[PDB]
Each structure stands twice: as C-alpha cells, then as structure tokens.
C-alpha cells in the first residue's frame, strides 16, 4: 500500500504535553513488522481509531484497497495492544487517543510514502 507526499497547532504540542511521557503511538507498535507492511499496520490504527476527521477519511478511503498477503496476525496483535490500552484507560484512553491524533498523521505519512 501507499499514499503520496501531496497528502495548525503544529508541533508546539510539547508545550502542553510532556514529551518525556509514554505515548500510545510509539516504537513498540511496530515491533516485528516489516517496512513493506508498516502502511498496512498504520491503516489498521487509522480504522480502529476513526471507527472507535475530514483529513483522516480522505487518507482512509484510499486505503480500503490496501492489504497484504498471507496471515496478518503479527500486525493485528500489535494493533490490539493499542485498542486494549485506548480502552483500559476509559475516558483517558479516548482522550489520550484523541490527544495524539497528530502522531497518527506523522506516522501514517512517513510509512505510506
């Protein structure tokens, strides 16, 4: 799968959230997952997230056709780690998930181009 280069707070975000804290979106989300398959993992996080906005759906819609071949469990197990965490925190899961909506973008772009 792939997107293109083509596709307001800015990164002044760290004035408001301690950059030294744990994030939902981080290195561990990608453990065991090959380069060629990162955009597909990053689609799953996009589609969990929205589904549980305008800019986001423009990127999502395009990735309907994005899949891999063979078993994707090594991917879904990583995504499920995020979902479990974005629920176990309840309110805070939602808000923390909502709070990193931009990291989801930086990661999406970077994997899909």
């Amino acid at each position, epitope marked *: 799968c792939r997107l293109d280069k083509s596709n307001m707070l800015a990164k002044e975000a*760290w*004035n408001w*959230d*301690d950059i*030294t804290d744990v994030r939902l979106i981080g290195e561990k989300l990608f453990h065991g997952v090959s380069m060629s398959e990162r955009c597909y993992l990053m689609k799953q996080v996009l589609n969990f997230t929205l589904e549980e906005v305008p800019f986001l759906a423009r990127l999502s819609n395009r990735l309907s056709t994005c899949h891999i071949e063979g078993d994707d469990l090594h991917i879904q197990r990583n995504v499920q780690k995020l979902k479990d965490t974005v629920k176990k925190l309840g309110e805070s899961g939602e808000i923390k998930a909502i709070g990193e909506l931009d990291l989801l973008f930086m990661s999406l772009r970077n994997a899909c181009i």
Partner: antibody, heavy 125, light 106 residues
C-alpha cells in the same frame, strides 16, 4: 544570549523550606522545558524536576513528597520549593533550560542547553 | 543507564583525548556531552552525538549511535582539563553518567 540567574538563600536551617527562583533573560519560556538540577559535594549533577510551558511538571521520585516546581510566564521566572530540608540537601543548585523535541523512531531529545551559574545551599543548625 | 570510562584520564596538553560512554539500551543518536570545570556550572558541549553546541570549538567532536558513544578532543588545551559527563533523554534516577575527569599527566 539567553541567561539564567538563580536566586535563593545560601543558608538554611534543618526543617526550613528551600526556595529558589530563576529569572530567564534574553529569551522566552515557550518551546523549552525548565529544569532544576543539584550537585551534592563530590557527586555528579542530579535532576530534580522540570516544568513545561503549560504548567505540567515531572519530579525526581526520590524528592517527590517534598518538591514543588512552578513558573510565572509573565515574569519570565520559574521556581523550586523543597520542604523539610536536612544536611542531605546541601548542594549547588542550578536552573537549566531544556531543549526538547521529536527525534529517532517516534522518540525524543532532551538537552540542558543553558545553565545558571549555580547557587550553593547549605543546611546547617 | 549510562556508563563512562575511564573514571580518570591522565594526559598531556596537546595530546588527543578519547572518552567513552556506553548506554545499556539504545538511545539512538540523542546523546549529549557536558563539560564542567571546578567551581563552575556544567556546560553543553555536544548534542545528538556529534553536533557542537553554541560556542564550542572545533577540537571537540563526537560520534556513535545506539549504545556506544565517543567524545574526542583532538588536541588538549589547558582549559580542557575538567570533568566530562554524558546524558541522553530523561533517564532516572541518574540522568548523567558518572563523569570522566581529564587530569594533567606528569
């Protein structure tokens, strides 16, 4: 050039409250973190805590129950309070500006890039 | 955590000095080195493994990545005999390494 000037008392008695202020000149407090560091005699520098522009703090857990860090953006100051001092708190205390940002694989950098000249704090009866 | 070697380095002026820092887990390239002379505040020397901080002269250089890092002073001047500390991210309880003291050999 950005300059940080610590201000605090040189001498305290046990059980007093230490309080120190740093005045930031020649730069702004937005887009940096602001830290307190101390260096006990004979030791390496030790990080006490930081504060971000928004007011969230993080503290060294070993001082956690005694330490407060605050900031006053309209004055370009930030402050340290440490309760119930003993001889164990004797050290040179430094304020430091922290440069932070994203780097590596979804990670960060953190450098104490501008330091005050330090204020010696002795606790003694 | 960060391990500096050696505790003390005894060298002659004009000599080249090489200091090591090893991290127990990767810090990528986000390591810094600081200099402190006696009486004075520490000072940032090198950041992101190899970039000279403001005002730092050309004889100071650094390299490494992951876990293994090196600070080089290509020709020691009188003013360079001091303690050097490494630091990477916000590591607790010890944010700084133990330090390497660069002493004049005679």
């Amino acid at each position: 050039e950005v300059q940080l000037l610590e201000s605090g008392p040189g001498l305290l008695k046990p059980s007093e409250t230490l309080s120190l202020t740093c005045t930031v000149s020649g730069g702004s407090m937005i887009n940096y973190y602001w830290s307190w560091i101390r260096q006990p005699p004979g030791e390496r520098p030790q990080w006490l805590g930081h504060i971000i522009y928004g007011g969230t703090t993080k503290y060294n857990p070993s001082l956690e129950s005694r330490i407060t860090i605050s900031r006053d953006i309209s004055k370009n100051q930030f402050s340290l309070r440490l309760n119930s001092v003993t001889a164990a708190d004797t050290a040179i205390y430094y304020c430091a500006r922290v440069a932070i940002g994203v780097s590596g694989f979804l990670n960060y950098y953190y450098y104490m890039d501008v330091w005050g000249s330090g204020t010696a704090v002795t606790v003694s009866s | 955590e960060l391990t500096q070697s050696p505790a003390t380095l005894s060298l002659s002026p004009g000599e080249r000095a090489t200091l090591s820092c090893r991290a127990s887990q990767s810090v990528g390239r986000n390591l810094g080195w600081y200099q402190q002379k006696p009486g004075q505040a520490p000072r940032l020397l090198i950041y992101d493994a190899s970039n000279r901080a403001t005002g730092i002269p050309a004889r100071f250089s650094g390299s490494g990545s992951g876990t293994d890092f090196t600070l080089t002073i290509s020709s020691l001047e009188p003013e360079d005999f001091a303690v050097y500390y490494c630091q990477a991210r916000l590591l607790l309880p010890q944010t700084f390494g133990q330090g390497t003291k660069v002493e004049i050999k005679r």
